[PDB]
Enzyme design. Structure first.
Site, mmCIF file in Angstrom:
data_model
loop_
_atom_site.group_PDB
_atom_site.id
_atom_site.type_symbol
_atom_site.label_atom_id
_atom_site.label_comp_id
_atom_site.label_asym_id
_atom_site.label_seq_id
_atom_site.Cartn_x
_atom_site.Cartn_y
_atom_site.Cartn_z
ATOM 1 N N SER A 1 -32.615 -21.022 -7.363
ATOM 2 C CA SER A 1 -33.631 -19.998 -7.145
ATOM 3 C C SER A 1 -33.542 -18.884 -8.180
ATOM 4 C CB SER A 1 -33.501 -19.421 -5.736
ATOM 5 N N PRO B 1 -33.510 -16.957 -11.681
ATOM 6 C CA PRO B 1 -33.539 -15.523 -11.363
ATOM 7 C C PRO B 1 -34.721 -15.143 -10.477
ATOM 8 N N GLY B 2 -35.498 -16.122 -10.017
ATOM 9 C CA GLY B 2 -36.642 -15.871 -9.168
ATOM 10 C C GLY B 2 -37.983 -15.932 -9.868
ATOM 11 N N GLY B 3 -38.001 -15.939 -11.202
ATOM 12 C CA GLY B 3 -39.266 -16.027 -11.914
ATOM 13 C C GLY B 3 -39.978 -17.346 -11.681
ATOM 14 N N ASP C 1 -29.800 -20.357 -3.889
ATOM 15 C CA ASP C 1 -29.003 -19.760 -4.955
ATOM 16 C C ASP C 1 -27.543 -19.787 -4.534
ATOM 17 N N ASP D 1 -24.789 -25.062 -1.403
ATOM 18 C CA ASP D 1 -24.593 -25.913 -2.568
ATOM 19 C C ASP D 1 -25.783 -26.847 -2.753
ATOM 20 N N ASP E 1 -33.855 -26.737 -11.838
ATOM 21 C CA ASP E 1 -33.600 -25.951 -13.045
ATOM 22 C C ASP E 1 -32.094 -25.942 -13.288
ATOM 23 N N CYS F 1 -31.881 -25.356 -19.949
ATOM 24 C CA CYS F 1 -31.917 -24.195 -20.828
ATOM 25 C C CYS F 1 -31.419 -24.501 -22.236
ATOM 26 C CB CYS F 1 -31.090 -23.054 -20.227
#
Lengths: 174, 110, 127, 260
Positions: free
Chosen positions: D83, D85-87, D106, D133, D151, D188
């Site tokens: 979750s 950073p929430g973006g 998260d 988890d 992600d 990333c």
RNA sequence: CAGGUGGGGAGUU
């Protein structure tokens, strides 16, 4: 995670009615989706039935937040400690006070709304009554208690204070 | 007694065009062997009208008052078909996110 | 509903009545009385046009597919002359509360195809 | 780059507010119709009244791309492995138009509190914040999510963790869902061993998951042969972005559909 | 059938 007691619900109902009046029934009853209030720790959260179904699996200690918080339940059963319900209360606010850009910055910083900075009023706002502060763009700003009425505010000095700020949108980032 | 004449006029009007009258006939005490035949004829006329207006983007919106009236009042099959048509129209409208100026996309969807 | 609105309209001074008026549009789909009630509601000081009027007008636009074109044009002109700047009332809009029975989250396109030729011209003028 | 919240205000209104505030912003290409790239801004972007009100949220274009690749549908059960950073969660909620159930998980409580604060600022009401988890979430917390958003953080330990998270996401994805069992995996970094190897390992582990086109209008195709390592033919459907190619932060996006 | 939640309820310290 606890179901709200009758005394706890009645304590917050008066506080909600102080700003929304009798419009609380609109949020209380919704046949489209069973979105009701729930008590997690000291923060009351307005969540849907599916949200409660999803938050059911989450642990009470693990579930830090859910939905929108209406304010922490203090020892004296006080509300509005969280301003996350400002958007919900904006649509049902009985009295709305529009503040010009001169007082918009002080309102964001938490300063009380001055008489000279008051742009528009509902003309029927009683003293010590819960109202909603708004900007020129019809955007909610925060929570403010007005200690003066429109009958006396129509002829008042610029230095006088009308509405004392209690919550603001700036507290989200402050 | 004159209901079959009204059904024939409704069918002729539907063909020329290619709801409130059909709903009133369906909600009539006679409709709500001859009664069954009139109900079937009314359902066929309603289906023809729904199919004719199904191409319109606002088909679910136009049929919404009829669906509510039908729900309040063969009839189950017609209501289910109307609900499915409204759902398909709503999905098409949701997919058609083009602005009102770009009416070609709506026409292409139609 | 008209009597309740008239009583509330008294100088120097209703949700159930408002809900009843909104829900009664579908069975209706008298025109002068409806127009007068809408004008009185618009004439109310700051009681409307808070994004709620558009939701109320959405049902009126949907129900406007029937009845005389003059009545439909007057109903459209009621919102056309409104000081509110909302323009999504004739298209997708905000959530439809107050019982709903509609899209929460078009009509002029179907209104153009009508028996009265002036309906298409009115729709084009509105657009 | 700042992503405008459609649930709060329109892109044109946000652009007008930024112009009034004195911030030079332009649309971020044609793939995103709401992302605005700020070139010059005298006033602070994060301190703007619109940002405080939740009109715009500072999110990367590459991060916003995974939300578009996932393509959440209204009234659907979408679960996100990370979750923070929430973006991405806010973008998914905006796409869903506050419909359905969004499972925001998260593992870090410190990031979870920030994500909850961002959700409250954005006004999302159908998002559930949980701390569990990701690997154990499909079996111990909940499964059968209509859409899965993995992600994965972005070396050998990270790849093993990413593979474990991908397997849990595939298990949590319901192949019988009406909206379809679509799982979107995002990274990333552009490391081949982190993206292509994980995708190949996940495909081998779960035959019921088939790689599908991500739908991105931009992005390099996934590599099928890298030195002695050869990937599956379906790996080319993955979208890869590079700083020197897409002018954005390097990321890898993959889409998988579950049949059984 | 398995899992989650569970000062909601029952029982132990």
């Amino acid at each position: 995670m606890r179901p709200l007691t009758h005394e706890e619900t009645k304590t917050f109902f008066e506080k909600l009615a102080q700003y929304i009046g009798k419009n609380i029934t609109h949020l209380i009853d919704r046949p489209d989706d069973p979105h009701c209030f729930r008590l997690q720790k000291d923060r009351v959260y307005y969540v849907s039935e599916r949200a409660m179904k999803m938050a059911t699996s989450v642990a009470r200690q693990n579930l830090m937040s859910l939905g929108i918080c209406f304010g922490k339940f203090t020892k004296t059963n006080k509300f509005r400690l969280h301003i996350t319900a400002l958007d919900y209360i904006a649509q049902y606010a009985r009295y709305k006070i529009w503040v010009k850009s001169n007082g918009e910055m002080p309102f964001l910083y938490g300063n009380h709304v001055l008489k000279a900075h008051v742009g528009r009023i509902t003309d029927d706002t009683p003293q010590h009554q819960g109202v909603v502060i708004y900007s020129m763009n019809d955007t909610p700003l925060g929570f403010g208690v007005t200690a003066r009425s429109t009958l006396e505010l129509r002829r008042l000095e610029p230095t006088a204070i009308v509405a004392f700020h209690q919550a603001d949108v700036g507290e989200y980032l402050r | 007694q004159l209901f079959p004449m009204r059904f024939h006029i409704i069918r002729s009007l539907i063909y020329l065009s290619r709801a409130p009258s059909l709903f009133e006939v369906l909600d009539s005490s006679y409709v709500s062997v001859y009664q069954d035949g009139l109900i079937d004829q009314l359902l066929e006329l309603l289906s023809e009208y729904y199919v004719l207006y199904a191409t319109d983007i606002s088909f679910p919106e136009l049929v919404i008052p009829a669906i509510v009236r039908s729900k309040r009042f063969g009839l189950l099959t017609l209501v289910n078909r109307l609900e499915q048509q409204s759902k398909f129209m709503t999905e098409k409208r949701n997919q058609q996110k083009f602005a009102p100026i770009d009416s070609d996309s709506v026409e292409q969807f139609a | 509903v008209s009597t309740a609105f008239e009583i509330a309209s008294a100088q120097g001074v209703l949700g159930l009545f408002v809900q009843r008026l909104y829900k009664i549009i579908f069975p209706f789909s008298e025109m002068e009385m409806l127009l007068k009630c809408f004008q009185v509601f618009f004439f109310k000081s700051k009681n409307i046009s808070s994004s709620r009027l558009s939701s109320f007008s959405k049902r009126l636009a949907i129900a406007s597919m029937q009845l005389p074109e003059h009545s439909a044009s007057a109903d459209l002109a009621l919102l056309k002359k409104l000081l509110s700047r909302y323009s999504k009332l004739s298209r997708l809009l905000t959530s439809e509360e107050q019982i709903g029975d509609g899209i929460y989250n078009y009509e002029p396109f179907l209104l153009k195809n009508h028996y009265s030729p002036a309906v298409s011209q009115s729709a084009k003028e509105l657009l | 780059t700042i992503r405008t919240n459609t649930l709060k205000t329109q892109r044109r209104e946000l652009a007008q507010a930024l112009i009034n505030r004195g911030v030079n912003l332009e649309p971020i290409g044609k793939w995103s119709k709401v992302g605005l790239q700020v070139f010059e801004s005298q006033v602070p972007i994060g301190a703007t009244p619109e940002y405080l009100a939740g009109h715009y949220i500072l999110q990367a274009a590459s991060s916003f791309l995974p939300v578009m690749a996932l393509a959440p549908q209204p009234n659907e059960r979408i679960l996100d492995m990370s979750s923070a950073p929430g973006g991405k969660v806010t973008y998914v909620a905006a796409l869903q138009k506050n419909t359905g159930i969004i499972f925001a998980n998260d593992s870090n409580k410190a990031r979870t509190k920030a994500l909850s604060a961002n959700i409250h600022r954005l006004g999302v009401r159908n998002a559930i914040v949980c701390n569990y988890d990701g690997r154990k979430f499909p079996n111990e917390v909940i499964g059968g999510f209509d859409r899965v958003l993995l992600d994965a953080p972005c070396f050998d330990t990270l790849s093993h963790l990413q593979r474990q998270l991908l397997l849990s996401a595939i298990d949590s994805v319901n192949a019988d869902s009406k909206t379809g069992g679509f799982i979107v995996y995002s990274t990333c970094s552009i490391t081949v061993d982190e993206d292509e190897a994980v995708i190949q390992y996940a495909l081998k582990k779960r035959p019921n998951v088939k790689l599908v086109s991500t739908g991105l209008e931009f992005g390099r195709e996934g590599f099928t042969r890298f030195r002695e390592k050869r990937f599956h033919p379906s790996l080319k459907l993955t979208r890869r972005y590079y700083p020197h190619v897409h002018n954005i932060d390097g990321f890898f996006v993959a889409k998988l559909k579950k049949i059984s």
